[model samples]
Target: TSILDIRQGPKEPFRDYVDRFYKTLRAEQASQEVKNAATETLLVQNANPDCKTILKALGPGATLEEMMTACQGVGGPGHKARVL
Candidate 1:
């Protein structure tokens, strides 16, 4: 599947979203160059600002797993979904 298929819904749980994104990064058949490019852009763009703080810190070169790990427990039903 393509990374394009994954997007973080406004209220979607962060863990669920990143997990899918990382999985796509690995399962996609594209070259590493192409895959990383898509991942770098999409991961930050689709994530909420709270998640973005950690993701941007991880920097563009961070591995898919690292990005996912940094964002763990960040957004979900009991998290930022209720924050204004």
Candidate 2:
């Protein structure tokens, strides 16, 4: 299945989803660029509308590490979805 098809299931927590995503990416032997793009694309696409701002602030071509750090810094998934 395409990595992009992987998503944070309703029953899944964000942290768990991140770990799963990394594992999947590694298993696929995806390149650094592919990993970064896939991660950013998936995260942004699934993220709550409020979270989009935080993701956008990362600017274009943000790396996976950068996005992860920002998301974590903002406070786990709960905080990300909330406007707080």
Candidate 3:
């Protein structure tokens, strides 16, 4: 399948999901813009509802890195999302 296959499960954590997604994307090819947009959308879209909410707070057009931090640390050291 295509990059559309990049998916994060409801019970899974963002660390593993993001890692898998990046590995899959690396197997394919794309420009920085394409990668950034696709990753931001896919990561957030495919996340569990709770995780998606955390990521969504970043708003549209956030940097890929910002998106990553949001998933892993958008809430900070209390670690609401990943802490569980």
Residue-by-residue lDDT tens digits, candidate 3, 1-84? 455566665455567777777777787757558845766677678665656787778787677677667666534345557755
Q: What lDDT does each candidate get?
A: 0.70, 0.62, 0.66
Q: What TM-score, computed on C-alpha atoms, does each candidate reach?
A: 0.49, 0.45, 0.54
lDDT of 3 at 68: 61
* Model 1 C-alpha lDDT versus the unseen true structure: 0.70
lDDT (Cα, tens digit) per residue for candidate 2, span 1-84: 455555655445556656666666677856658645656666666654434567788876687677656666554446556654
Ranking by lDDT: 1, 3, 2
Task: Pull out the clashing pairs in model 2.
Answer: none
What C-alpha lDDT does candidate 3 achieve relative to the native structure? 0.66
Q: Highest lDDT: which candidate?
A: 1
Worst 10 residues of 2 by lDDT: 5-14
Q: Which candidate achieves the best TM-score against the true structure?
A: 3
Clashes of 2: 0
Ranking by TM-score: 3, 1, 2
Q: Which segments of model 2 are wrong by more than 4 Å?
A: 1-15, 22-39, 76-84
